[PDB]
Amino acid sequence: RIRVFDQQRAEAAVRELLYAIGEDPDRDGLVATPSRVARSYREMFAGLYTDPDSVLNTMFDEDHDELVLVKEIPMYSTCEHHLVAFHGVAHVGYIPGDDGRVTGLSKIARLVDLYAKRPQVQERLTSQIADALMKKLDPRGVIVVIEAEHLCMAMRGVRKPGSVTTTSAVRGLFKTNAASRAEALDLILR
Amino acid sequence: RVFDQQRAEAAVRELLYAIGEDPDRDGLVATPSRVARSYREMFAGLYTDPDSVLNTMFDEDHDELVLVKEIPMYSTCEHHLVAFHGVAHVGYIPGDDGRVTGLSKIARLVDLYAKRPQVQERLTSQIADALMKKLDPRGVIVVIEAEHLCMAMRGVRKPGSVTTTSAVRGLFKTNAASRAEALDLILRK
Amino acid sequence: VFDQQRAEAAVRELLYAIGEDPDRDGLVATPSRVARSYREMFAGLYTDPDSVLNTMFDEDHDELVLVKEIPMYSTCEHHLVAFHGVAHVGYIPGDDGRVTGLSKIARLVDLYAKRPQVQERLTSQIADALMKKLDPRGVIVVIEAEHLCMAMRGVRKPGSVTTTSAVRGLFKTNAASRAEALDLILR
Amino acid sequence: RVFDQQRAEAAVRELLYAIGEDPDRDGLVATPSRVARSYREMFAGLYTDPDSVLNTMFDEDHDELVLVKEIPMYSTCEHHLVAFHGVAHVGYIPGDDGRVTGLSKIARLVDLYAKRPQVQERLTSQIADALMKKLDPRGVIVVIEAEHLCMAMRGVRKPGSVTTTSAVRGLFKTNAASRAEALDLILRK
Amino acid sequence: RVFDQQRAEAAVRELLYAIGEDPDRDGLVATPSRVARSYREMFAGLYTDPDSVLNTMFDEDHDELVLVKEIPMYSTCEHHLVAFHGVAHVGYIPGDDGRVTGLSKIARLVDLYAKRPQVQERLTSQIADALMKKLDPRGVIVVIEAEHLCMAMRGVRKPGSVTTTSAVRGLFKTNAASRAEALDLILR
Amino acid sequence: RVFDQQRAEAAVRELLYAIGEDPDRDGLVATPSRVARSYREMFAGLYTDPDSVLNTMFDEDHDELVLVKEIPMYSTCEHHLVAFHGVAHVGYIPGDDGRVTGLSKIARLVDLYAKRPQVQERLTSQIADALMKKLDPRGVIVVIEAEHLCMAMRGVRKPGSVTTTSAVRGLFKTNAASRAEALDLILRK
Amino acid sequence: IRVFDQQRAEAAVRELLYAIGEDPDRDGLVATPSRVARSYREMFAGLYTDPDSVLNTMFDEDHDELVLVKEIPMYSTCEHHLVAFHGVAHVGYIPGDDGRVTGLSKIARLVDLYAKRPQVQERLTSQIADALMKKLDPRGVIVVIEAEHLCMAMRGVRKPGSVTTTSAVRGLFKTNAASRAEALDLILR
Amino acid sequence: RVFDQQRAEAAVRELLYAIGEDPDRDGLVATPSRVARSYREMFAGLYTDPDSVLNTMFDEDHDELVLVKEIPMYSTCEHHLVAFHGVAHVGYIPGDDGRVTGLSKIARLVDLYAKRPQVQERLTSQIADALMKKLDPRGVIVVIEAEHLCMAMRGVRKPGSVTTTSAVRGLFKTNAASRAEALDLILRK
Amino acid sequence: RVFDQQRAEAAVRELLYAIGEDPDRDGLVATPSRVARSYREMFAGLYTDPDSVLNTMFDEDHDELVLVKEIPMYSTCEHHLVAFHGVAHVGYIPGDDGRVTGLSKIARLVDLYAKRPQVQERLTSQIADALMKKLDPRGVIVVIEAEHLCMAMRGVRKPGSVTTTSAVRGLFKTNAASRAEALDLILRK
Amino acid sequence: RVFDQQRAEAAVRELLYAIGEDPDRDGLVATPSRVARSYREMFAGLYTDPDSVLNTMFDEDHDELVLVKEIPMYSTCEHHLVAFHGVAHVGYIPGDDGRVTGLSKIARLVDLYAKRPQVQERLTSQIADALMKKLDPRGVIVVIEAEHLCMAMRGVRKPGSVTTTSAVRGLFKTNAASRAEALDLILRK
Numbered sequence A: 001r002i003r004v005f006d007q008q009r010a011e012a013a014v015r016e017l018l019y020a021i022g023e024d025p026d027r028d029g030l031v032a033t034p035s036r037v038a039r040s041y042r043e044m045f046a047g048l049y050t051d052p053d054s055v056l057n058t059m060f061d062e063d064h065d066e067l068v069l070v071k072e073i074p075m076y077s078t079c080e081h082h083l084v085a086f087h088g089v090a091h092v093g094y095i096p097g098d099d100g101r102v103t104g105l106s107k108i109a110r111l112v113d114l115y116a117k118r119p120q121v122q123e124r125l126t127s128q129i130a131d132a133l134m135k136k137l138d139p140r141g142v143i144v145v146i147e148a149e150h151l152c153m154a155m156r157g158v159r160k161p162g163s164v165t166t167t168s169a170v171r172g173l174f175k176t177n178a179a180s181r182a183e184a185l186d187l188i189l190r
Numbered sequence B, D, F, H, I, J: 001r002v003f004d005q006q007r008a009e010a011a012v013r014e015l016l017y018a019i020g021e022d023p024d025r026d027g028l029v030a031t032p033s034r035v036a037r038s039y040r041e042m043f044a045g046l047y048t049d050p051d052s053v054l055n056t057m058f059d060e061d062h063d064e065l066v067l068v069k070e071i072p073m074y075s076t077c078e079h080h081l082v083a084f085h086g087v088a089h090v091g092y093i094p095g096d097d098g099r100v101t102g103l104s105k106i107a108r109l110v111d112l113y114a115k116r117p118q119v120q121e122r123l124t125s126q127i128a129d130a131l132m133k134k135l136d137p138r139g140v141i142v143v144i145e146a147e148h149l150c151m152a153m154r155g156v157r158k159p160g161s162v163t164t165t166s167a168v169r170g171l172f173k174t175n176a177a178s179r180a181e182a183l184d185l186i187l188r189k
Numbered sequence C: 001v002f003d004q005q006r007a008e009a010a011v012r013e014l015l016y017a018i019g020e021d022p023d024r025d026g027l028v029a030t031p032s033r034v035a036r037s038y039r040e041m042f043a044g045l046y047t048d049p050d051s052v053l054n055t056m057f058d059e060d061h062d063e064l065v066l067v068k069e070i071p072m073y074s075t076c077e078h079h080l081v082a083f084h085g086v087a088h089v090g091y092i093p094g095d096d097g098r099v100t101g102l103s104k105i106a107r108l109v110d111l112y113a114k115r116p117q118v119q120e121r122l123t124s125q126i127a128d129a130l131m132k133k134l135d136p137r138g139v140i141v142v143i144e145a146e147h148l149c150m151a152m153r154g155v156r157k158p159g160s161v162t163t164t165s166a167v168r169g170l171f172k173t174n175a176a177s178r179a180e181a182l183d184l185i186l187r
Numbered sequence E: 001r002v003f004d005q006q007r008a009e010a011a012v013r014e015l016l017y018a019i020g021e022d023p024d025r026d027g028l029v030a031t032p033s034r035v036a037r038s039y040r041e042m043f044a045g046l047y048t049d050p051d052s053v054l055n056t057m058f059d060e061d062h063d064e065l066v067l068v069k070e071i072p073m074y075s076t077c078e079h080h081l082v083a084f085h086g087v088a089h090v091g092y093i094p095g096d097d098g099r100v101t102g103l104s105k106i107a108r109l110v111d112l113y114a115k116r117p118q119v120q121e122r123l124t125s126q127i128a129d130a131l132m133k134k135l136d137p138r139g140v141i142v143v144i145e146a147e148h149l150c151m152a153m154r155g156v157r158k159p160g161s162v163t164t165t166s167a168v169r170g171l172f173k174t175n176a177a178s179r180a181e182a183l184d185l186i187l188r
Numbered sequence G: 001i002r003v004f005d006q007q008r009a010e011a012a013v014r015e016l017l018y019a020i021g022e023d024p025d026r027d028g029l030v031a032t033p034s035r036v037a038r039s040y041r042e043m044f045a046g047l048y049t050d051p052d053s054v055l056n057t058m059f060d061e062d063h064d065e066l067v068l069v070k071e072i073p074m075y076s077t078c079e080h081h082l083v084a085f086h087g088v089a090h091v092g093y094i095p096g097d098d099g100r101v102t103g104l105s106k107i108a109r110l111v112d113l114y115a116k117r118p119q120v121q122e123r124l125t126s127q128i129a130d131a132l133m134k135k136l137d138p139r140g141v142i143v144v145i146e147a148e149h150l151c152m153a154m155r156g157v158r159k160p161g162s163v164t165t166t167s168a169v170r171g172l173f174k175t176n177a178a179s180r181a182e183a184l185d186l187i188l189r
């Protein structure tokens, strides 16, 4: 469901937030901040305003049926519990189907970006990317791996800075075959 | 600067409405309260004076540099309220009287200056100024290596870029040879 | 406009000329597939590369913006043989802070590259377009591509990589700025 | 097969018109003729029989594997007429008669089979079959490591990706240890 | 405990005479005062309850292990009053309530238990017990790697030897696999 | 100097009461006596002259540097009575007479000067001076690499810091080339 | 007028086997005179075919920069001892204004035919360089040969595996030292 | 046996005429004599008894394996009169009598058997058998690792391939465990 | 036992005459006295009781293994009067009483037993037995890693070979797990 | 310069009495005869002329450095009759005449000069002088790296120390670059 971004409502909330935390919204470093924060939230939650699935295009690979691997996909998301960024990379691997259906690398990157640009938990994000790729490409298998840094507890000096959370999702052939998942994972780690 | 908790929660709920979400759904019904509490810690520097954390001690035996590295540094961009995080490195030359301070106290000083609406260059300069003021050392050097996320999220910069800022006071500011040597020790791991 | 029917006829005539049998199983679909490959291979002729760039502003920082390992697939205009590699684009935003998306710079490289090209012309065209759109303080473009024209013949070593660079604005006037940018790009 | 130069040139000029270019402009007047000549060498395998290049010699001393590596391999996808290029590795175990052949002669066989409208898997099998036919060896193994550009051009696969294909005949197919050993030697630099 | 300064200082000056030194020479003029201060810091754990430093916080996002490594650890052997120093590694799995604590707070807890007349095994067990009590975790593991100087001082042992001790509570005590995994992370 | 056990023990029991502990627990039942004994061995150098330990030998074959490395070194800061421990490296060039001495004797000399209320520089200078006196060599070099605990215990300095001191006498003092190489020899592991 | 006499060569080898004290009729040597004669025909094939005529005509329309050929198989025989010295050759030439170039296999055959003679390595390298100058009329030529000599290893005089390196520069490479530096660096890399 | 120099030189002059060269040219006027001298050292084993070189000595301390590695081994293929060169490894277990012999003596025995028209397998067996006869050992093991040039000369193989041969006698032949450890020891650097 | 200087010097001069040297030349005039002097130190263990050097001390802190590694070990083969030298490793588990001994005293015990006409196995057992008798530990382990020169001097063995011997007493002899662990620590340097 | 074995055995038995041993115990019964036998091989250089071992050969192809490395070297200090052992490195530049010699002969020359009562520095110079006379080379360089045990036995020096000596003749002495290059090659592993 496509949602509504209310610029003016967001800016008013941000200015109220500055008063609540004790800051002075009128000082020079914060005059434009309510506006800049609203703009950042529009981009930070862009996935709510465009359907992530619609970005993928249709193409066919007539030569090969081998694994298509996409690596080091930029991944910037926001914890839904604390509205704090967790950022890293995503790795998507799919085996084209009998029809040879494929899609552009830039299009897979945008799909990941739109699912990540929502109030998210990393496990939900990994599963959603894999499910959409299965739905749209009708591939034999899909694998998604996200390597991200969570900042919620590191900021509150509870966990070591730099810790990396890793999540994976497997569909189709990678789910049924243990050898296939193991080989795909090795390619991602190397 | 007094933290109004109810005002913060109300603003966050308004923010959830603004972005089109439903604050009453289960995944966000506790979000306004959790975000307000997080903001209390993210801006903790606004409520306690960072300079006051430092304690008084004297090292009478030594004349060498005191160097502290990989101090956790978590801050918030004042322009976008988005985190930039990394590490800080503090080096000071104790004065003739030998005044020093605990390592944990320097870490607390960095944390409190960083836990504010900040710009990285301002944060580095503030840390250097506080150490000079309180310790009266011969020299101070501060280096912050932090990852900024504001422009990376908007696909403008490559992820993982690290910004480095430095501030030099006293001996490190007046003497270029000393600044070069100190910088080498901080950068080399 | 791309005349597909004309292209398919040309490719089929070409198969006859080289001695192949166009009716063979691996070549019956080839005239249509080759025409489609040429539509994308010369896609730059149909879209203005400069038009892809968007307008954005960096309010926080003014340091170098570096974009690396941009896929670059092009075709030699003399022999219609591919040369492929990567491109590296680095620009210093101006006072206004104008910037552009990483994907938009990537598409700009692709569209200029999807033309009958010589690598040196391509490097300058990318650098010039960024200057035009961003009005930056400086721009640097480096292309590392493998040329196949003489490797296809028996004249050149396989795997040789041609490197070209173009510097604009601050990078050309300041030797330190150019030298530092190159070190990060190559490493 | 006979190469017709003028027919190829007419097709190339027709193709340049089809893509919207002007063949008469100064940067492309000579291009149709250059493309016709490049095609003469790019499909040279169609005009000379690859098998005839091999010469006759016998190894009376040893019966161990003959391995030839980093053989230049330049071919053309038959589906898209786009180059895919890399290296080939040929290893054969001489038979009882000890029949062997020169490294350069094997290189020419790979080159002539590769200079055709090809699919990499067919190319590997054809090379192995010819060595099997002519040398009557105990076994043959052929490995091709080439970079394909057809789908990388259409941003579908990662640039720089390497396709590896293999063909095993005789002893290398029947003995798993022999295949494992030969493969290990081929992959090592 | 209650610390008396002049009583310690009188003992230190008495000690210098006993060992044959001259307390009035310039190297030792200020030694009696500094030694009393050093004992105040060396036994700071006797004067503050180590358990009280921990603060209360809750992690609602995660269920994973919290691991803190290379915690500075400086202690004193109770038999010889000679320092043994190294690092401590603390790992706890938060309970259902998600209770956690700050890293600096765990570091200070280790310091105060270490700043006592100690034997390394007692130190490790005391730290593990304190974390179990305050955090109510599913499991706790403590590992201390310290260099002992008592016997190296008496030319009895090779310099540089490292003593390693471990303490496991809750999940790590009941599960052998979990203990092996947690240990592997600590030694690497 | 002489060691009065009863005076030391009375001070130690007084010290344990001063810090507030219970002497009757089993960890302190026998500690008051051991502290007197530990101080006897920790300050054993005050009771034996370090210079007398060296023995007499002559090297008739060689006149090159004699280098002894990783000599165990355990000492105590005189200001805080806290141990600083590490290694010592002693290198001397035998004189015209070819005079040399045993490694075990050099180790004991370092130990006896080290088993005192000490400052690292004074210890290094004393060892070097004693070697010059006893061996009458052409040159002597002494290097001590020790870890100091005084300020690390007070959380003021980084744990693991290594203090390095040097003393050069005779030929190593007059010649920079020989000193530079000798220093290189000591640091290499 | 040169001609290879198979029968005369075999007779000489059989006389050679008698001279060294061996029995030519034993089973391990019955076929040796014929196999050695056949090997000498291939080892001195350069005397029977003109090396220069092998080069073909081609033109590079894209670039005028250096064409570099590396790891060309090179097998030759010392004329003084009739013992093989073997290695690789590296040929680099800058095309002229006309852009003239030639095939890699053609350059390889020119090197091989000059090498397949009674040779001295430096004269071999110079002859390759001159032939490339005359045939390609390039701006410059550089040839480098890295070969292993076996003459003294056979006579237990030198360690096996030593590599003799020779170079020859013509045209632009001889006049310009900078050009030599880049090209030479390219060959050794 | 004895070496007929004049007969060898005449054979070489006939060989030069047969291959089409001019023996009277300056490079080849001295070649026949130089080749004869090379054959004298190359086939020195035919002129000296390998068995007589070993000397008599007794090992009174130990009965464990005596291992000899990296023994220079230079030989000539009897089929092509082309060198194959490498190293030999000899390990023997002294008998009950404790008989042993010098390393230089094993080196000369290896050299004399190797300095003949040889095939590597025969060479390995001959060394092992001679050691068994003379030393009264419990067991003997010989390994030769050599590079063959015969097929590399005829452009069939890449240079540098290494042939490995082994021969086991006595205990190493009867005990699989003893041979297995010894083989691992010989191959490891 | 007591060394007889004059008898030793007379024997050495007789030895120099026997080997054909000139005792009166300048490099040998003082050799008989120097050799006798070296022998007094080389066999010093025969003149002082090795067991008496160990002192008594108690470890109240720990019950772990006490491990001593790289103890200098210089001995003389009794069969050839040739040195074999290396290191010794001594590990003992103190009993409940905590009885221990100094590192320098263990070194002297090893030195005195080693400074005799010896065979390595006897030396290892003697050291282990002495430690058991004096310290009454739960267990003792002694490992000697030494290079023997007896057979290297007579060119029978490869130089650099290391002979390893071990002796286990008490707990290390009864418990294989405890012995296996101690051995692993000693071998891994 | 005869070897009087019976005289040597009598001296060894007298030596055993002198050190306090019982020559009649079973561990020393055979020692005097074993020591005399070892001495015949250990001082073999005194009985045969080292210079005569070199043979006459000529290198007509090349005049660059011939380098022989890791030559086994076992010698005895003349002052203490204690072994010092290591390796020797010999490098010579052939003259215009090209005179050279076998590697084994250089090894034999080094062995016999080393198989004497020696001081390492005389040994290095004698080897260089012998090569200078026999080969009439342009230059010679000799380097010996040996471990001395005399003072390590007397716990005066660290075990394992390596003494390095060098001798340069002719071209290597007059040209500093030639000496520097040769020295670098010798020290490189």
Ligand SMILES: [Cl-]
Pocket: C024, C025, C026, C027
């Ligand atoms: Cl087909």
Ligand SMILES: [Cl-]
Pocket: D186, D187, D188, D189
């Ligand atoms: Cl490869």
Ligand SMILES: [Cl-]
Pocket: E186, E187, E188
């Ligand atoms: Cl660790």
Ligand SMILES: [Zn+2]
Pocket: A079, A080, A081, A082, A083, A084, A152, E061
């Ligand atoms: Zn969160």
Ligand SMILES: [Zn+2]
Pocket: B077, B078, B079, B080, B081, B082, B150, B151, C060
């Ligand atoms: Zn920002």
Ligand SMILES: [Zn+2]
Pocket: C076, C077, C078, C079, C080, C081, C149, G062
């Ligand atoms: Zn081209």
Ligand SMILES: [Zn+2]
Pocket: A063, D077, D078, D079, D080, D081, D082, D150, D151
């Ligand atoms: Zn294709």
Ligand SMILES: [Zn+2]
Pocket: E077, E078, E079, E080, E081, E082, E150, E151, I061
């Ligand atoms: Zn203790």
Ligand SMILES: [Zn+2]
Pocket: B061, F077, F078, F079, F080, F082, F150, F151
């Ligand atoms: Zn201190």
Ligand SMILES: [Zn+2]
Pocket: G078, G079, G080, G081, G082, G083, G151, J061
């Ligand atoms: Zn030659």
Ligand SMILES: [Zn+2]
Pocket: D061, H077, H078, H079, H080, H081, H082, H150
């Ligand atoms: Zn052969």
Ligand SMILES: [Zn+2]
Pocket: H061, I077, I078, I079, I080, I081, I082, I150, I151
């Ligand atoms: Zn012996």
Ligand SMILES: [Zn+2]
Pocket: F061, J077, J078, J079, J080, J081, J082, J150
């Ligand atoms: Zn000596």
